[PDB]
Amino acid sequence: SFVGLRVVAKWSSNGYFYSGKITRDVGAGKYKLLFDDGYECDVLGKDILLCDPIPLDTEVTALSEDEYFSAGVVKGHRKESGELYYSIEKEGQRKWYKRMAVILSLEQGNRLREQYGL
Numbered sequence: 001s002f003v004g005l006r007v008v009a010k011w012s013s014n015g016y017f018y019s020g021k022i023t024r025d026v027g028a029g030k031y032k033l034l035f036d037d038g039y040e041c042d043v044l045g046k047d048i049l050l051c052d053p054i055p056l057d058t059e060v061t062a063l064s065e066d067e068y069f070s071a072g073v074v075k076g077h078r079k080e081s082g083e084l085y086y087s088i089e090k091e092g093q094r095k096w097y098k099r100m101a102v103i104l105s106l107e108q109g110n111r112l113r114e115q116y117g118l
């Protein structure tokens with residue numbers, strides 16, 4: 001799990017897992033991360049899901065204005081000019097979300113913890 005890798009990690013006790021990038025190995029099982037929204041801090045490795053992008057059938061939380069909890073299943077990955085978009089399916093229908101808009105609730109994150117642990 002070295003430097004430069006895209007990851008999804010939670011930086012607050014009981015916070016969601018957000019899209020970020022491993023910025024440096026701080027040692028002691030901690031890495032400094034630079035989240036897509038600009039925020040940066042050290043995060044315990046055990047709270048870092050090492051996957052880019054989130055796997056095809058993962059259940060995730062897709063953000064949209066005034067929408068903080070709507071879940072959906074990743075059904076596609078599309079790369080439009082250097083940017084990753086997720087095709088999220090919810091209730092038989094799909095919508096596009098920018099990588100930064102897909103998040104993982106604590107429960108959703110755990111389902112991936114085993115495989116992409118670190």
